[PDB]
Structures are given as structure tokens and as C-alpha cells.
Amino acid sequence: SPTQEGWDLTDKATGLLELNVAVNMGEPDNDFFQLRADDLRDETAYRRRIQSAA
Amino acid sequence: MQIKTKGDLVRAALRKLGVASDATLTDVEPQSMQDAVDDLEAMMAEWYQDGKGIITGYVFSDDENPPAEGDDHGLRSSAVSAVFHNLACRIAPDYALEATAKIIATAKYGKELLYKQTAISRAKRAPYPSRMPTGSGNSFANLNEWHYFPGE
């Protein structure tokens, strides 16, 4: 708030002001990955991959 | 091996037949050599069915090189006898001849020997069916929930 000093304040009344800020969002962060059907290396480790993704 | 070119294979085939060489005074004629080189190329291109047939290391002539004769055949040491015996058999009908029984037998033996190692390599077993359990003895499979084999 502003503040004046004096006795007579004719035509010195101020107004009100209230600024603001904005918060937004960007883009998702993904871990898109694939699982080949016939793969031992894909059958194993597809849970360690989830942990590493987390 | 002293047999290192398509012309060398053709000379061996003609000598086997009895059309060239020094056992008789007859000499190799260029028109009878070009035809035999054509027949050899056709025979090996038929045997090597785009890689799904008999593998021998033969190197196929390119249209750029003027004489197909003169090039190395590219075979191994153990393919030469089979190749030129079968060539003699193939080119015998041109001279109204007939390859002798010994040449026919050697050609059969050589072709079979040529395909033997390829047959051994191609004798392979398929993987387990996709509808087949891994069993509870396979501890790693029971761990990462690999209850069934992949298949294909």
C-alpha cells in the first residue's frame, strides 16, 4: 500500500492494485519402451526396467 | 591345386571326356571352350539356388569382364573334382558322346560330398513350442515369471 503525509487530501485519494503471477505445465516425461515376444532378454529385466524408469 | 580357373576346369572336363589333352593328340578348340564355360556357369548357377542350394564358393562372372574364361573359379580344393566331373557329364551330349560309368559315379559321389557339410549345418532343431511350460526346476524362469517358452 502507498502512504501520503498531510492534512488536506482533496483529489489525492488513490486506487487499488493487486498484481498476480501464473503457474503452468510443460510436457509429460515418458519411458516408452518395447517388449519383443520371443526374447529371453526381454522376458527377464522387464521389471528392473520399470524400477530404473521410476 | 593346379586347377585354378574356369578354363582349367573346362580343360579337365574335356580331358576326362576324351576331347582334348595329350593322351590323344587333340587340342582344345576355342569354340568348344566357350560353350563349356557357358555350361559350367549355368550348372553352378543352378546348383547355387540363390544361396538356398549347394554352397561351394564359386565366383560368378560379371558382364563387364570380357572373357569369362581366365577368371578364378573361387572354389575350395575339395570341390574341383566334383565340379569338373559334373561338367564333363553335362557337356558330353554336345559331341554326341556319353560320359563313362566311372565319370558318372565320380560325379554323383562328388556332388554328395559337396553338399554333406551344408546338410550337417542345415540339420537344426526348432525351439520349444510357444505353448510349453518352462517347468518349476528352471529357477530363473520361476523367478522372473518366465513360465512358458517364447516359441518360433
Tell me which method was used to determine the 3D structure: cryo-EM
Q: Which of B22, B25, B24, B41 lies closest to B33 in space, CA to CA?
A: B41
DSSP B25-38: S----HHHHHHHHH
Which of B139, B144, B146 to substitute to test the interface with A, most A CBs within 10 Å? B144
What residues have CB less than 8 Å from A2, skipping those under 6 apart? Answer: A14
Q: Pick from B121, B120, B114: which is nearest to B55 by CA?
A: B114
Q: Please indicate whether, in this complex, the C-beta atoms of B150 and A47 are within 8 angstroms of each other.
A: no
Interchain proximity B150–A45, CB inside 8 Å:
no
Q: Note whether B146 contacts A37, CB cutoff 8 Å.
A: no
Cβ-nearest to A43 among B127, B130, B146: B146
Is the CB of residue A35 less than 8 Å from the CB of residue A50? no
> What residues pair up with B72 in beta bridges, in sequence order?
B5
Q: What's the rounded Cα separation, in Å, for the pair B8 and B128?
A: 49
B97: region left, alpha or beta (phi > 0 left; psi from -120 to 50 alpha): beta
C-alpha cell at A19: 498484481
Cell triple for B104: 558318372
Beta-carbon contacts of B130 under 8 Å, excluding residues fewer than 6 positions away, are A38, B148, B149, B150, B151, B152
Q: Tell me which chain B residues have a C-beta less than 8 angstroms from the C-beta of A43.
A: 144, 146, 150
Residues whose CB is less than 8 angstroms from the CB of residue B3 and which lie 6 or more positions away in sequence, other chains included: B9, B12, B80, B84
| Cell representation of residue B73 | 573359379
Cα B142 from chain centre: 48
List all residues 6 or more positions away from B41 whose beta carbon is below 8 Å from its beta carbon.
B6, B60, B61, B68
B58 neighbors B46 (Cβ within 8 angstroms)? no
Is there a contact between B36 and B91 (Cβ–Cβ < 8 Å)? yes
Tell me the C-alpha distance between B86 and B83, whole Å.
5
d(C-alpha B145, C-alpha B152), whole Å: 19
Cβ atoms within 10 Å, residue A7 = 4
User: How close is the nearest chain A Cα to the Cα of B140, in Å?
Assistant: 9
- Could you identify the residue written with the cell 557329364? B89
Contact assignment for B144 to A43 by CB distance below 8 Å: yes
**CB pair distance less than 8 Å for A44 and B140:** yes
Q: Which three cell numbers stand for residue A12?
A: 489525492
Q: Report the amino acid identity of residue B53.
A: G
Q: Residue B63, SS3? A: coil
Question: How far apart are alpha carbons B48 and B58 in whole angstroms?
Answer: 9
CA–CA gap between residue B143 and residue A29 (Å, rounded): 30
Residue of A nearest to B144 (CA): A44
Query: CB pairs below 8 Å between A and B: how many?
Result: 18
Is the torsion defined by CA of B42, B44, B47, B49 positive or negative?
A: negative
Contacts of B150 in chain A (CB under 8 A): 37-40, 43
Residues 6+ apart with CB under 8 A from B120: none
Count Cβ neighbours within 10 Å for each residue of B46-55 and write b for 16 or more, e otherwise: ebbeeeeebb
The CA distance from B68 to B51, in Å, is: 21
Amino acid identity of residue A38, one-letter, is D
Do residues B46 and B69 make contact, with C-beta atoms less than 8 angstroms apart? no
